[PDB]
């Protein structure tokens, strides 16, 4: 059997105590779904977190540079994952974000993972700003 579905969403703050930390951050996404179906392939996931940073448009592009595949997207606010290959196995990706300006908004984060189709099947998770804080300075 079973299986359902599985999702993977994490980050790599390195530490929450340094500036470089806040300056730049890293995110990790993974999708793992199984079913009994035959099929197919591909994996699609979407994540939405703190949207209070400034990711790199090109950075994500780097993922695409991976072998001309696996592709992911970042809408500055939210991020998406799209890969095809599968077979069997799960997939993961990595990204980076930057902050610049502060703002003020505090809110939680959510994440969702799907695989095709239908019904049922998918996984969903939640996240929060990790470490948030600010201050700064300036």
Short mmCIF file of N, CA, C and O in Angstrom, two decimals, unseen atoms left out:
data_model
loop_
_atom_site.label_atom_id
_atom_site.label_comp_id
_atom_site.label_asym_id
_atom_site.label_seq_id
_atom_site.Cartn_x
_atom_site.Cartn_y
_atom_site.Cartn_z
CA UNK A 1 0.59 -2.70 -0.27
C UNK A 1 0.31 -1.77 -0.31
O UNK A 1 0.15 -1.84 -0.62
N UNK A 2 0.26 -0.93 0.00
CA UNK A 2 0.00 0.00 0.00
C UNK A 2 0.29 1.06 0.00
O UNK A 2 0.37 0.90 0.08
N UNK A 3 0.45 2.11 -0.09
CA UNK A 3 0.73 3.20 -0.11
C UNK A 3 0.36 4.02 -0.56
O UNK A 3 0.38 4.22 -1.37
N UNK A 4 0.02 4.49 0.00
CA UNK A 4 -0.36 5.29 -0.34
C UNK A 4 0.41 6.40 -0.94
O UNK A 4 0.86 6.28 -2.03
N UNK A 5 0.55 7.46 -0.20
CA UNK A 5 1.26 8.60 -0.65
C UNK A 5 2.21 9.12 0.42
O UNK A 5 2.07 8.80 1.59
N UNK A 6 3.15 9.93 -0.02
CA UNK A 6 4.13 10.51 0.89
C UNK A 6 4.60 11.85 0.34
O UNK A 6 4.67 12.03 -0.87
N UNK A 7 4.91 12.75 1.25
CA UNK A 7 5.38 14.07 0.87
C UNK A 7 6.63 14.41 1.67
O UNK A 7 6.82 13.92 2.77
N UNK A 8 7.46 15.24 1.07
CA UNK A 8 8.70 15.65 1.71
C UNK A 8 8.95 17.14 1.53
O UNK A 8 9.16 17.60 0.42
N UNK A 9 8.92 17.85 2.63
CA UNK A 9 9.14 19.28 2.60
C UNK A 9 9.98 19.68 3.81
O UNK A 9 9.57 19.50 4.94
N UNK A 10 11.15 20.23 3.52
CA UNK A 10 12.05 20.66 4.56
C UNK A 10 12.84 21.89 4.12
O UNK A 10 12.62 22.40 3.04
N UNK A 11 13.74 22.32 4.98
CA UNK A 11 14.56 23.48 4.69
C UNK A 11 15.96 23.29 5.22
O UNK A 11 16.23 22.35 5.92
N UNK A 12 16.83 24.19 4.88
CA UNK A 12 18.21 24.13 5.32
C UNK A 12 18.66 25.51 5.74
O UNK A 12 19.39 26.17 5.03
N UNK A 13 18.20 25.91 6.93
CA UNK A 13 18.55 27.20 7.46
C UNK A 13 19.98 27.21 7.98
O UNK A 13 20.52 27.99 8.24
N UNK A 14 20.54 26.34 8.10
CA UNK A 14 21.89 26.24 8.57
C UNK A 14 21.97 26.63 10.01
O UNK A 14 22.56 26.10 10.76
N UNK A 15 21.38 27.55 10.37
CA UNK A 15 21.38 28.01 11.71
C UNK A 15 20.68 29.20 11.93
O UNK A 15 20.70 29.93 11.37
N UNK A 16 20.08 29.37 12.74
CA UNK A 16 19.38 30.46 13.03
C UNK A 16 20.09 31.21 14.09
O UNK A 16 19.77 31.15 15.21
N UNK A 17 21.04 31.89 13.71
CA UNK A 17 21.80 32.64 14.61
C UNK A 17 22.77 33.48 13.86
O UNK A 17 23.38 34.18 14.33
N UNK A 18 22.88 33.37 12.69
CA UNK A 18 23.77 34.11 11.86
C UNK A 18 23.02 34.88 10.83
O UNK A 18 21.91 34.61 10.56
N UNK A 19 23.69 35.87 10.26
CA UNK A 19 23.10 36.68 9.25
C UNK A 19 23.02 36.00 7.93
O UNK A 19 22.03 36.05 7.27
N UNK A 20 24.06 35.37 7.57
CA UNK A 20 24.11 34.68 6.34
C UNK A 20 22.98 33.73 6.29
O UNK A 20 22.57 33.36 5.23
N UNK A 21 22.51 33.35 7.45
CA UNK A 21 21.43 32.45 7.55
C UNK A 21 20.21 33.10 7.03
O UNK A 21 19.59 32.61 6.15
N UNK A 22 19.91 34.19 7.61
CA UNK A 22 18.78 34.92 7.22
C UNK A 22 18.96 35.47 5.81
O UNK A 22 18.08 35.49 5.04
N UNK A 23 20.11 35.89 5.53
CA UNK A 23 20.42 36.44 4.23
C UNK A 23 19.97 35.52 3.14
O UNK A 23 19.28 35.92 2.24
N UNK A 24 20.38 34.30 3.27
CA UNK A 24 20.03 33.32 2.30
C UNK A 24 19.64 32.02 2.97
O UNK A 24 20.20 31.67 3.99
N UNK A 25 18.68 31.34 2.37
CA UNK A 25 18.21 30.09 2.89
C UNK A 25 18.04 29.05 1.80
O UNK A 25 18.16 29.36 0.63
N UNK A 26 17.76 27.83 2.23
CA UNK A 26 17.57 26.74 1.30
C UNK A 26 16.31 25.95 1.65
O UNK A 26 15.93 25.86 2.81
N UNK A 27 15.68 25.42 0.61
CA UNK A 27 14.47 24.65 0.79
C UNK A 27 14.61 23.30 0.09
O UNK A 27 15.36 23.18 -0.88
N UNK A 28 13.89 22.32 0.60
CA UNK A 28 13.93 20.98 0.03
C UNK A 28 12.52 20.45 -0.17
O UNK A 28 11.68 20.58 0.72
N UNK A 29 12.29 19.87 -1.33
CA UNK A 29 10.99 19.33 -1.66
C UNK A 29 11.16 17.91 -2.20
O UNK A 29 12.11 17.62 -2.90
N UNK A 30 10.22 17.06 -1.85
CA UNK A 30 10.25 15.68 -2.29
C UNK A 30 8.84 15.13 -2.39
O UNK A 30 7.97 15.50 -1.62
N UNK A 31 8.65 14.25 -3.36
CA UNK A 31 7.36 13.64 -3.58
C UNK A 31 7.52 12.13 -3.69
O UNK A 31 8.39 11.64 -4.41
N UNK A 32 6.66 11.42 -2.98
CA UNK A 32 6.69 9.97 -3.00
C UNK A 32 5.27 9.42 -2.92
O UNK A 32 4.66 9.42 -1.89
N UNK A 33 4.79 8.95 -4.01
CA UNK A 33 3.46 8.39 -4.07
C UNK A 33 3.45 7.08 -4.77
O UNK A 33 4.17 6.90 -5.66
N UNK A 34 2.64 6.19 -4.35
CA UNK A 34 2.53 4.90 -4.92
C UNK A 34 1.16 4.46 -5.08
O UNK A 34 0.50 4.64 -4.67
N UNK A 35 0.76 3.89 -5.69
CA UNK A 35 -0.53 3.42 -5.91
C UNK A 35 -0.57 2.20 -6.61
O UNK A 35 -0.06 1.66 -6.53
N UNK A 36 -1.19 1.79 -7.28
CA UNK A 36 -1.31 0.63 -7.99
C UNK A 36 -1.65 0.83 -9.23
O UNK A 36 -2.08 0.19 -9.60
N UNK A 37 -1.44 1.71 -9.84
CA UNK A 37 -1.72 2.00 -11.03
C UNK A 37 -0.91 2.05 -11.92
O UNK A 37 -0.41 2.27 -11.79
N UNK A 38 -0.79 1.86 -12.79
CA UNK A 38 -0.04 1.88 -13.70
C UNK A 38 0.53 2.69 -14.22
O UNK A 38 0.98 2.51 -14.88
N UNK A 39 0.49 3.54 -13.89
CA UNK A 39 0.99 4.37 -14.32
C UNK A 39 1.64 5.35 -14.34
O UNK A 39 1.64 5.50 -14.10
N UNK A 40 2.18 5.98 -14.64
CA UNK A 40 2.83 6.94 -14.70
C UNK A 40 3.31 7.55 -14.49
O UNK A 40 3.10 7.53 -14.36
N UNK A 41 3.94 8.06 -14.47
CA UNK A 41 4.46 8.67 -14.28
C UNK A 41 4.81 10.03 -13.96
O UNK A 41 5.02 10.40 -14.10
N UNK A 42 4.87 10.74 -13.52
CA UNK A 42 5.19 12.06 -13.17
C UNK A 42 4.82 12.40 -11.74
O UNK A 42 3.99 11.73 -11.13
N UNK A 43 5.45 13.43 -11.24
CA UNK A 43 5.19 13.87 -9.89
C UNK A 43 5.00 15.38 -9.88
O UNK A 43 5.80 16.12 -10.44
N UNK A 44 3.93 15.80 -9.23
CA UNK A 44 3.62 17.21 -9.14
C UNK A 44 3.32 17.57 -7.69
O UNK A 44 2.47 16.96 -7.06
N UNK A 45 4.04 18.56 -7.19
CA UNK A 45 3.86 19.01 -5.83
C UNK A 45 3.87 20.53 -5.78
O UNK A 45 4.43 21.17 -6.65
N UNK A 46 3.25 21.06 -4.76
CA UNK A 46 3.18 22.49 -4.58
C UNK A 46 3.40 22.83 -3.11
O UNK A 46 2.85 22.18 -2.24
N UNK A 47 4.20 23.85 -2.88
CA UNK A 47 4.49 24.28 -1.53
C UNK A 47 4.28 25.79 -1.42
O UNK A 47 4.55 26.53 -2.36
N UNK A 48 3.82 26.20 -0.26
CA UNK A 48 3.57 27.61 -0.01
C UNK A 48 4.00 27.95 1.41
O UNK A 48 3.38 27.59 2.33
N UNK A 49 5.06 28.65 1.53
CA UNK A 49 5.58 29.04 2.82
C UNK A 49 5.93 30.45 2.89
O UNK A 49 6.00 30.98 1.97
N UNK A 50 6.14 31.00 4.00
CA UNK A 50 6.47 32.33 4.21
C UNK A 50 6.66 33.13 3.18
O UNK A 50 7.44 33.60 2.87
N UNK A 51 5.93 33.26 2.67
CA UNK A 51 6.00 33.99 1.68
C UNK A 51 6.43 35.38 2.03
O UNK A 51 5.90 36.22 1.90
N UNK A 52 7.39 35.57 2.46
CA UNK A 52 7.90 36.83 2.82
C UNK A 52 9.37 36.98 2.53
O UNK A 52 10.06 37.67 3.24
N UNK A 53 9.80 36.31 1.49
CA UNK A 53 11.18 36.36 1.10
C UNK A 53 11.32 36.63 -0.38
O UNK A 53 10.35 36.92 -1.04
N UNK A 54 12.53 36.54 -0.86
CA UNK A 54 12.80 36.77 -2.24
C UNK A 54 13.69 35.68 -2.79
O UNK A 54 14.90 35.74 -2.67
N UNK A 55 13.04 34.66 -3.40
CA UNK A 55 13.76 33.55 -3.96
C UNK A 55 14.43 33.95 -5.27
O UNK A 55 14.29 34.99 -5.73
N UNK A 56 15.14 33.09 -5.83
CA UNK A 56 15.83 33.33 -7.07
C UNK A 56 15.09 32.64 -8.20
O UNK A 56 14.81 31.46 -8.12
N UNK A 57 14.80 33.40 -9.23
CA UNK A 57 14.10 32.88 -10.38
C UNK A 57 15.03 31.98 -11.17
O UNK A 57 14.61 30.96 -11.67
N UNK A 58 16.30 32.41 -11.26
CA UNK A 58 17.28 31.65 -11.98
C UNK A 58 17.72 30.44 -11.19
O UNK A 58 17.93 29.38 -11.73
N UNK A 59 17.83 30.63 -9.92
CA UNK A 59 18.24 29.56 -9.04
C UNK A 59 17.46 28.30 -9.33
O UNK A 59 18.03 27.25 -9.52
N UNK A 60 16.18 28.46 -9.34
CA UNK A 60 15.32 27.35 -9.59
C UNK A 60 15.62 26.79 -10.94
O UNK A 60 15.53 25.60 -11.13
N UNK A 61 15.97 27.68 -11.82
CA UNK A 61 16.29 27.29 -13.14
C UNK A 61 17.40 26.29 -13.11
O UNK A 61 17.46 25.40 -13.93
N UNK A 62 18.26 26.45 -12.16
CA UNK A 62 19.37 25.57 -12.02
C UNK A 62 18.93 24.13 -11.91
O UNK A 62 19.62 23.24 -12.33
N UNK A 63 17.77 23.95 -11.36
CA UNK A 63 17.22 22.63 -11.19
C UNK A 63 16.94 22.04 -12.53
O UNK A 63 17.10 20.87 -12.72
N UNK A 64 16.53 22.88 -13.42
CA UNK A 64 16.22 22.46 -14.73
C UNK A 64 17.48 22.12 -15.45
O UNK A 64 17.46 21.32 -16.33
N UNK A 65 18.53 22.75 -15.05
CA UNK A 65 19.79 22.53 -15.65
C UNK A 65 20.28 21.16 -15.33
O UNK A 65 21.18 20.67 -15.95
N UNK A 66 19.68 20.58 -14.37
CA UNK A 66 20.04 19.27 -13.96
C UNK A 66 20.09 18.37 -15.08
O UNK A 66 20.40 17.98 -15.19
N UNK A 67 19.77 18.06 -15.88
CA UNK A 67 19.77 17.21 -16.98
C UNK A 67 18.66 17.48 -17.84
O UNK A 67 18.21 16.63 -18.37
N UNK A 68 18.26 18.66 -17.96
CA UNK A 68 17.21 19.04 -18.75
C UNK A 68 15.96 18.45 -18.25
O UNK A 68 15.18 18.27 -18.87
N UNK A 69 15.82 18.16 -17.14
CA UNK A 69 14.69 17.59 -16.55
C UNK A 69 14.40 17.99 -15.29
O UNK A 69 15.05 18.77 -14.94
N UNK A 70 13.43 17.46 -14.65
CA UNK A 70 13.05 17.76 -13.44
C UNK A 70 12.95 19.04 -13.35
O UNK A 70 13.86 19.63 -13.15
N UNK A 71 11.85 19.42 -13.51
CA UNK A 71 11.62 20.61 -13.46
C UNK A 71 10.76 21.19 -12.36
O UNK A 71 9.77 20.61 -12.03
N UNK A 72 11.17 22.31 -11.83
CA UNK A 72 10.45 22.97 -10.79
C UNK A 72 10.29 24.42 -11.08
O UNK A 72 11.00 24.95 -11.88
N UNK A 73 9.35 25.03 -10.40
CA UNK A 73 9.08 26.42 -10.58
C UNK A 73 8.87 27.14 -9.28
O UNK A 73 8.42 26.55 -8.31
N UNK A 74 9.20 28.41 -9.29
CA UNK A 74 9.06 29.21 -8.12
C UNK A 74 8.35 30.50 -8.49
O UNK A 74 8.85 31.25 -9.29
N UNK A 75 7.21 30.71 -7.90
CA UNK A 75 6.43 31.88 -8.16
C UNK A 75 6.71 32.94 -7.12
O UNK A 75 5.84 33.71 -6.76
N UNK A 76 7.91 32.94 -6.67
CA UNK A 76 8.31 33.89 -5.68
C UNK A 76 7.64 33.59 -4.39
O UNK A 76 8.17 33.54 -3.53
N UNK A 77 6.50 33.41 -4.30
CA UNK A 77 5.75 33.13 -3.13
C UNK A 77 5.67 31.64 -2.91
O UNK A 77 6.07 31.15 -1.97
N UNK A 78 5.15 30.98 -3.81
CA UNK A 78 5.01 29.57 -3.73
C UNK A 78 5.97 28.88 -4.69
O UNK A 78 6.55 29.53 -5.54
N UNK A 79 6.11 27.58 -4.53
CA UNK A 79 6.99 26.80 -5.37
C UNK A 79 6.26 25.57 -5.87
O UNK A 79 5.37 25.06 -5.19
N UNK A 80 6.65 25.12 -7.04
CA UNK A 80 6.04 23.95 -7.64
C UNK A 80 7.13 22.97 -8.06
O UNK A 80 8.26 23.37 -8.32
N UNK A 81 6.75 21.70 -8.13
CA UNK A 81 7.67 20.66 -8.52
C UNK A 81 7.03 19.78 -9.58
O UNK A 81 5.89 19.38 -9.44
N UNK A 82 7.79 19.52 -10.63
CA UNK A 82 7.31 18.69 -11.72
C UNK A 82 8.43 17.85 -12.31
O UNK A 82 9.37 18.37 -12.87
N UNK A 83 8.31 16.56 -12.16
CA UNK A 83 9.30 15.64 -12.67
C UNK A 83 8.63 14.44 -13.27
O UNK A 83 7.53 14.12 -12.95
N UNK A 84 9.31 13.80 -14.13
CA UNK A 84 8.78 12.63 -14.78
C UNK A 84 9.79 11.62 -14.88
O UNK A 84 10.56 11.73 -15.36
N UNK A 85 9.75 10.66 -14.40
CA UNK A 85 10.64 9.63 -14.42
C UNK A 85 10.35 8.68 -13.62
O UNK A 85 10.48 8.43 -13.36
N UNK A 86 9.95 8.17 -13.25
CA UNK A 86 9.63 7.26 -12.47
C UNK A 86 9.45 6.26 -12.24
O UNK A 86 9.18 6.17 -12.28
N UNK A 87 9.61 5.52 -11.99
CA UNK A 87 9.47 4.53 -11.75
C UNK A 87 9.69 3.98 -10.72
O UNK A 87 10.01 3.33 -10.56
N UNK A 88 9.52 4.28 -10.05
CA UNK A 88 9.70 3.83 -9.04
C UNK A 88 10.30 4.28 -8.01
O UNK A 88 10.68 3.72 -7.28
N UNK A 89 10.36 5.28 -7.98
CA UNK A 89 10.91 5.82 -7.05
C UNK A 89 10.53 7.22 -6.71
O UNK A 89 9.99 7.84 -7.38
N UNK A 90 10.83 7.68 -5.67
CA UNK A 90 10.53 9.00 -5.24
C UNK A 90 11.49 10.00 -5.87
O UNK A 90 12.48 9.62 -6.47
N UNK A 91 11.16 11.26 -5.71
CA UNK A 91 11.98 12.32 -6.25
C UNK A 91 12.07 13.46 -5.25
O UNK A 91 11.24 13.58 -4.37
N UNK A 92 13.09 14.27 -5.40
CA UNK A 92 13.30 15.40 -4.52
C UNK A 92 13.96 16.54 -5.27
O UNK A 92 14.48 16.35 -6.35
N UNK A 93 13.92 17.72 -4.66
CA UNK A 93 14.50 18.89 -5.26
C UNK A 93 14.99 19.83 -4.17
O UNK A 93 14.69 19.65 -3.00
N UNK A 94 15.75 20.82 -4.58
CA UNK A 94 16.29 21.79 -3.66
C UNK A 94 16.22 23.18 -4.22
O UNK A 94 16.34 23.33 -5.40
N UNK A 95 16.03 24.14 -3.37
CA UNK A 95 15.95 25.51 -3.77
C UNK A 95 16.58 26.46 -2.77
O UNK A 95 17.02 26.03 -1.73
N UNK A 96 16.60 27.73 -3.13
CA UNK A 96 17.18 28.74 -2.27
C UNK A 96 16.31 29.99 -2.27
O UNK A 96 15.64 30.27 -3.25
N UNK A 97 16.35 30.70 -1.17
CA UNK A 97 15.58 31.91 -1.03
C UNK A 97 16.40 32.97 -0.32
O UNK A 97 17.31 32.64 0.42
N UNK A 98 16.06 34.21 -0.58
CA UNK A 98 16.76 35.31 0.02
C UNK A 98 15.75 36.28 0.63
O UNK A 98 14.69 36.28 0.40
N UNK A 99 16.12 37.09 1.39
CA UNK A 99 15.26 38.06 2.03
C UNK A 99 15.76 39.34 1.93
O UNK A 99 16.57 39.48 1.90
N UNK A 100 15.26 40.25 1.87
CA UNK A 100 15.64 41.52 1.77
C UNK A 100 14.74 42.40 2.38
O UNK A 100 14.46 42.79 2.70
N UNK A 101 14.32 42.69 2.52
CA UNK A 101 13.47 43.52 3.09
C UNK A 101 12.49 43.03 3.93
O UNK A 101 11.96 42.40 3.74
N UNK A 102 12.29 43.34 4.87
CA UNK A 102 11.39 42.94 5.74
C UNK A 102 10.17 43.22 5.77
O UNK A 102 10.05 43.89 5.45
N UNK A 103 9.31 42.68 6.15
CA UNK A 103 8.11 42.86 6.23
C UNK A 103 7.42 42.45 7.17
O UNK A 103 7.68 42.17 7.59
N UNK A 104 6.55 42.42 7.49
CA UNK A 104 5.82 42.05 8.38
C UNK A 104 4.68 41.20 8.19
O UNK A 104 3.77 41.51 8.03
N UNK A 105 4.76 40.14 8.20
CA UNK A 105 3.75 39.24 8.03
C UNK A 105 3.97 38.00 8.55
O UNK A 105 4.72 37.46 8.21
N UNK A 106 3.31 37.57 9.36
CA UNK A 106 3.43 36.41 9.92
C UNK A 106 2.40 35.51 9.72
O UNK A 106 1.46 35.78 10.02
N UNK A 107 2.62 34.46 9.22
CA UNK A 107 1.73 33.52 8.97
C UNK A 107 2.34 32.18 8.78
O UNK A 107 3.50 32.07 8.52
N UNK A 108 1.52 31.15 8.92
CA UNK A 108 1.98 29.82 8.76
C UNK A 108 2.20 29.46 7.31
O UNK A 108 2.04 30.30 6.44
N UNK A 109 2.57 28.22 7.08
CA UNK A 109 2.82 27.74 5.75
C UNK A 109 2.13 26.39 5.54
O UNK A 109 1.87 25.68 6.50
N UNK A 110 1.87 26.09 4.29
CA UNK A 110 1.22 24.84 3.95
C UNK A 110 1.91 24.23 2.74
O UNK A 110 2.56 24.93 1.97
N UNK A 111 1.76 22.92 2.60
CA UNK A 111 2.36 22.20 1.50
C UNK A 111 1.42 21.08 1.05
O UNK A 111 0.70 20.51 1.86
N UNK A 112 1.46 20.80 -0.24
CA UNK A 112 0.63 19.75 -0.80
C UNK A 112 1.42 18.98 -1.85
O UNK A 112 2.27 19.55 -2.52
N UNK A 113 1.11 17.71 -1.97
CA UNK A 113 1.78 16.86 -2.93
C UNK A 113 0.75 15.97 -3.63
O UNK A 113 -0.09 15.36 -2.98
N UNK A 114 0.86 15.91 -4.94
CA UNK A 114 -0.04 15.11 -5.73
C UNK A 114 0.71 14.31 -6.78
O UNK A 114 1.87 14.51 -6.99
N UNK A 115 0.03 13.41 -7.42
CA UNK A 115 0.62 12.58 -8.44
C UNK A 115 -0.34 12.40 -9.57
O UNK A 115 -0.51 12.25 -10.05
N UNK A 116 -0.95 12.41 -9.95
CA UNK A 116 -1.89 12.25 -11.02
C UNK A 116 -3.02 11.82 -10.67
O UNK A 116 -3.00 11.39 -10.21
N UNK A 117 -3.99 11.96 -10.91
CA UNK A 117 -5.13 11.59 -10.63
C UNK A 117 -5.83 11.51 -10.01
O UNK A 117 -5.76 11.77 -9.67
N UNK A 118 -6.48 11.15 -9.89
CA UNK A 118 -7.20 11.03 -9.31
C UNK A 118 -7.70 10.93 -8.14
O UNK A 118 -7.70 11.23 -7.72
N UNK A 119 -8.12 10.51 -7.63
CA UNK A 119 -8.63 10.36 -6.51
C UNK A 119 -8.10 10.04 -5.50
O UNK A 119 -8.06 9.64 -5.33
N UNK A 120 -7.72 10.24 -4.85
CA UNK A 120 -7.20 9.98 -3.85
C UNK A 120 -6.22 9.73 -3.73
O UNK A 120 -6.32 9.25 -3.71
N UNK A 121 -5.28 10.08 -3.65
CA UNK A 121 -4.28 9.91 -3.53
C UNK A 121 -3.31 10.90 -3.49
O UNK A 121 -2.92 11.24 -4.12
N UNK A 122 -2.96 11.34 -2.73
CA UNK A 122 -2.04 12.29 -2.59
C UNK A 122 -1.69 12.51 -1.14
O UNK A 122 -2.29 11.91 -0.28
N UNK A 123 -0.71 13.36 -0.93
CA UNK A 123 -0.27 13.66 0.40
C UNK A 123 -0.22 15.17 0.61
O UNK A 123 0.00 15.92 -0.33
N UNK A 124 -0.44 15.57 1.84
CA UNK A 124 -0.42 16.98 2.18
C UNK A 124 0.25 17.17 3.53
O UNK A 124 0.07 16.37 4.42
N UNK A 125 1.02 18.24 3.63
CA UNK A 125 1.72 18.54 4.85
C UNK A 125 1.64 20.04 5.13
O UNK A 125 1.14 20.79 4.32
N UNK A 126 2.15 20.42 6.28
CA UNK A 126 2.14 21.82 6.68
C UNK A 126 3.51 22.24 7.17
O UNK A 126 4.27 21.41 7.62
N UNK A 127 3.78 23.52 7.08
CA UNK A 127 5.04 24.06 7.51
C UNK A 127 4.89 25.43 8.15
O UNK A 127 3.80 25.99 8.16
N UNK A 128 5.99 25.92 8.68
CA UNK A 128 5.99 27.22 9.33
C UNK A 128 7.35 27.87 9.14
O UNK A 128 8.27 27.27 8.88
N UNK A 129 7.43 29.08 9.29
CA UNK A 129 8.65 29.82 9.14
C UNK A 129 9.58 29.46 10.05
O UNK A 129 9.47 29.58 10.93
N UNK A 130 10.49 28.99 9.81
CA UNK A 130 11.43 28.61 10.60
C UNK A 130 12.39 29.40 11.22
O UNK A 130 13.26 29.53 11.20
N UNK A 131 12.18 29.91 11.76
CA UNK A 131 13.01 30.68 12.39
C UNK A 131 12.65 31.92 12.11
O UNK A 131 12.85 32.15 12.06
N UNK A 132 12.13 32.69 11.95
CA UNK A 132 11.75 33.91 11.68
C UNK A 132 12.05 34.90 12.41
O UNK A 132 11.80 34.86 13.02
N UNK A 133 12.59 35.75 12.31
CA UNK A 133 12.93 36.75 12.94
C UNK A 133 13.57 37.71 12.61
O UNK A 133 14.04 37.46 12.24
N UNK A 134 13.56 38.80 12.74
CA UNK A 134 14.14 39.80 12.46
C UNK A 134 14.61 40.71 12.62
O UNK A 134 14.45 41.02 12.65
N UNK A 135 15.19 41.10 12.71
CA UNK A 135 15.69 41.96 12.86
C UNK A 135 16.57 42.75 12.60
O UNK A 135 17.07 43.05 12.76
N UNK A 136 16.73 43.07 12.20
CA UNK A 136 17.55 43.82 11.91
C UNK A 136 18.18 44.54 11.72
O UNK A 136 18.15 44.37 11.94
N UNK A 137 18.75 45.32 11.30
CA UNK A 137 19.39 46.07 11.07
C UNK A 137 19.82 46.60 10.76
O UNK A 137 19.88 46.46 10.71
N UNK A 138 20.11 47.19 10.57
CA UNK A 138 20.53 47.75 10.27
C UNK A 138 21.22 48.48 10.12
O UNK A 138 21.57 48.70 9.72
#
